[PDB]
Enzyme design. Structure first.
Site, mmCIF file in Angstrom:
data_model
loop_
_atom_site.group_PDB
_atom_site.id
_atom_site.type_symbol
_atom_site.label_atom_id
_atom_site.label_comp_id
_atom_site.label_asym_id
_atom_site.label_seq_id
_atom_site.Cartn_x
_atom_site.Cartn_y
_atom_site.Cartn_z
ATOM 1 N N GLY A 323 0.806 -1.212 0.000
ATOM 2 C CA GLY A 323 0.000 0.000 0.000
ATOM 3 C C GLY A 323 0.843 1.267 0.000
ATOM 4 O O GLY A 323 1.999 1.259 -0.454
ATOM 5 N N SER A 324 0.284 2.339 0.563
ATOM 6 C CA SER A 324 0.781 3.702 0.383
ATOM 7 C C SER A 324 2.116 4.025 1.048
ATOM 8 O O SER A 324 2.662 5.114 0.870
ATOM 9 C CB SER A 324 -0.282 4.701 0.867
ATOM 10 O OG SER A 324 -1.227 4.994 -0.155
ATOM 11 N N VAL A 325 2.608 3.133 1.888
ATOM 12 C CA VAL A 325 3.917 3.357 2.491
ATOM 13 C C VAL A 325 4.981 3.609 1.418
ATOM 14 O O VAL A 325 5.871 4.405 1.629
ATOM 15 C CB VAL A 325 4.325 2.231 3.440
ATOM 16 C CG1 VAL A 325 3.358 2.198 4.628
ATOM 17 C CG2 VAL A 325 4.334 0.869 2.709
ATOM 18 N N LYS A 327 5.152 5.269 -1.306
ATOM 19 C CA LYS A 327 5.071 6.414 -2.189
ATOM 20 C C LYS A 327 6.358 7.233 -2.321
ATOM 21 O O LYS A 327 6.623 7.842 -3.360
ATOM 22 C CB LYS A 327 3.839 7.259 -1.853
ATOM 23 C CG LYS A 327 2.563 6.569 -2.295
ATOM 24 C CD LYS A 327 1.301 7.322 -1.879
ATOM 25 C CE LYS A 327 0.083 6.573 -2.408
ATOM 26 N NZ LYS A 327 -1.260 7.115 -2.034
#
Ligand SMILES: [Zn+2]
Ligand SMILES: [Zn+2]
Ligand SMILES: [Zn+2]
Length: 606
Positions: A323-325, A327
């Protein structure tokens, strides 16, 4: 003449960071056989059956080569069976294949055959253990009293290796038993490297990884023979010693308190229903300055039985959508490939390509379209920023409703995954265990997959990889191999943890290819995730009750990465909590924070 012989010593041991033992070398009493170059097979059979009077052999499992050996032991029979055939060593093997191993042996006979096999297996002048049903104290002391009647036979003491009950037991590994000598798969490796065939070696995890360090240094002797080959003299060449010891970087108490936290949070999330279809929760903490492993904790939740089990090895063996970790790694790829310049502003807007559903962030349409810097992209977890960045690695500029050209797709996916690999996302971490997963990284993929990879919804990574990634950021782009072992130590007087032989040095793997001032932009984004004051700030839970300044990034999945203290990082942590459906509170950052506070208590940072 001189025949040299090698005997084994005691294995080194394994200690946690405060000096508590994790394993045990336990002393037993055993029947030993020392063989002479002059014992015929017949002398062996006479010794075996004198011995059977004193020991119990209940479970007799004879291999057909053992049955052919015993059978050929009769001198006449050995001649007669060679006489009946169509280099002595070649004829033994030839006669061997010639007897039908469906011979007829009473059950008592089978027991002497078993004993013989044990004696026969021992090299000239070597000493090996004669496996029998366990011997009580009186049974032993009767053998001790008549052992002189049996050449070569005596009572002595050996070892079992035991793993103590601790939260680091799964990671210690196992050692081959004296009975099951070497592993047969690798038999050739070990004879070659120098070993004997009855050696006890590490077969998994730490015991295997540090086998060269743990293996006792062997006593070596030379036996001097007269002109007939009769033993005359016992000349030693090297005296043996206990193997060396390793001390881990992990403290049991710290590891215990992380295990409790994860178990506390996971049960709560089961309590309210959020964790119902979650496979478990995992956390790995690292010292970002050195790669030292502070803890590797995992709790496995069985989706069929509901049972919860400790799963520390899950940190290096199982993979999860991150997931967004991730980015910050995608932005890095933007800088490397000439797409982004410094803390560049883009428009946060839905991203609409021909052939796929429009892409939004967690906040959808709520604030319309608006300008956003790289720092703010991290602060808000903007998908628009990273999707536009990825399209730019593919050589294109975003315009709504564009048809996307895919000539540069493979090239683009390669450049993205290469940056990811610089942070350990999708590449080997270097951790000191025999075999780690390197992720689930599909070699076949399309354009939609490339795009989703950019915000962490395609390739799957292990919790160790996700810790190394945030630790790399915390160490200013220099990625360090994680190491569970802290140093190799000598034995003291009594045989316990002695003094430092050699510390395990820090190992630099690569330096992420972005400028110092680019890295400073990532650091400001992670700082604002936890300190920001926007309605879109995603990570204030990190700072809520924080005892040091924490920087981090939040992550269907509730994942989180963090380091601290902001200004001088001494811990970096990854928390992986997959398929938690709680949309009213995200425990990821709170777990990360509480692990950081736990560490600060235990090893004040400031
Ligand atoms: Zn002689
Ligand atoms: Zn999943
Ligand atoms: Zn403590």
């Amino acid at each position: 003449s001189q025949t040299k012989v090698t005997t084994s010593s005691a294995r080194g041991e394994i200690y946690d960071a405060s000096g508590k033992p994790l394993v045990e070398n336990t002393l037993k009493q055993v029947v030993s056989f020392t063989r002479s170059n002059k014992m015929t097979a017949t002398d062996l059979k006479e010794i075996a059956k004198k011995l059977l009077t004193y020991v119990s052999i209940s479970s007799p499992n004879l291999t057909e080569r053992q049955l052919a050996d015993y059978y050929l032991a009769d001198p006449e029979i050995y001649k007669k069976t060679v006489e009946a055939l169509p280099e002595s060593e070649l004829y033994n093997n030839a006669v061997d294949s010639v007897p039908t191993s469906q011979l007829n042996y009473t059950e008592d006979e089978k027991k002497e055959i078993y004993l013989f096999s044990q004696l026969n297996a021992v090299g000239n002048f070597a000493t090996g253990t004669i496996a029998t049903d366990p011997l009580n104290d009186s049974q032993v002391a009767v053998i001790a009293s008549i052992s002189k009647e049996m050449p070569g036979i005596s009572i002595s003491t050996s070892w079992d290796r035991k793993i103590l009950e601790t939260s680091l037991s799964s990671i210690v590994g196992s050692v081959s038993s004296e009975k099951a000598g070497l592993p047969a798969e690798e038999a050739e490796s070990y004879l070659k490297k120098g070993y004997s065939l009855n050696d006890r070696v590490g077969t998994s995890y730490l015991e295997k990884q540090y086998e060269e360090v743990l293996q006792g240094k062997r006593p070596v002797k030379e036996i001097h023979l007269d002109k007939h080959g009769d033993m005359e003299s016992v000349e030693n060449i090297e005296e043996g010693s206990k193997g060396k010891n390793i001390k881990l970087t992990i403290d049991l108490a710290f590891q215990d308190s992380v295990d409790a936290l994860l178990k506390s949070y996971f049960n709560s999330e089961l309590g309210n229903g959020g964790a119902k279809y979650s496979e478990g929760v995992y956390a790995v903490a690292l010292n970002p300055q050195t790669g030292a492993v502070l803890s590797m904790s995992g709790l496995k939740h069985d989706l069929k039985t509901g049972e919860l089990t400790p799963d520390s090895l899950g940190t290096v063996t199982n993979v999860f959508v991150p997931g967004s970790v991730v980015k910050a790694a995608t932005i890095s790829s933007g800088w490397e490939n000439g797409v982004l310049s410094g803390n560049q502003t883009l428009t946060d807007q839905p991203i609409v390509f021909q052939g796929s559903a429009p892409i939004y962030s967690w906040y959808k349409l709520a604030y319309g379209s608006f300008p956003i810097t790289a720092v703010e992209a991290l602060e808000y977890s903007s998908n628009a920023y990273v999707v536009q960045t990825a399209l730019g690695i593919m050589g294109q500029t975003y315009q709504p409703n564009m048809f996307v050209g895919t000539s540069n797709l493979e090239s683009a996916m390669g450049k993205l995954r290469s940056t990811f690999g610089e942070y350990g996302l999708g590449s080997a971490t270097g951790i000191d265990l025999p075999d780690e997963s390197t992720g689930l990284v599909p070699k076949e993929y399309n354009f939609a997959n490339f795009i989703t990879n950019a915000f962490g919804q395609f390739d799957n990574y292990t919790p160790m990889q996700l810790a190394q990634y945030v630790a790399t950021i915390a160490n200013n782009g220099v990625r360090l191999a994680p190491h569970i072992v802290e140093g190799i130590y000598d034995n003291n007087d009594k045989g316990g943890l002695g003094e430092l032989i050699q510390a395990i040095d820090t190992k630099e793997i690569n330096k992420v290819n972005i400028s110092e001032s680019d890295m400073a932009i990532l650091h400001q984004g992670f700082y604002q995730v936890s300190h920001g004051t926007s309605p879109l700030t995603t990570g204030r839970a990190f700072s809520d009750g924080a005892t040091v300044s924490i920087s981090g990034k939040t992550g269907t999945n509730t994942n989180a990465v963090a380091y601290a203290p902001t200004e001088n990082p001494q811990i970096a942590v990854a928390v992986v909590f997959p398929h938690n459906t709680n949309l009213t509170k995200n425990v990821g950052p709170a777990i990360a924070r509480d692990i950081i506070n736990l560490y600060n208590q235990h090893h004040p940072m400031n």
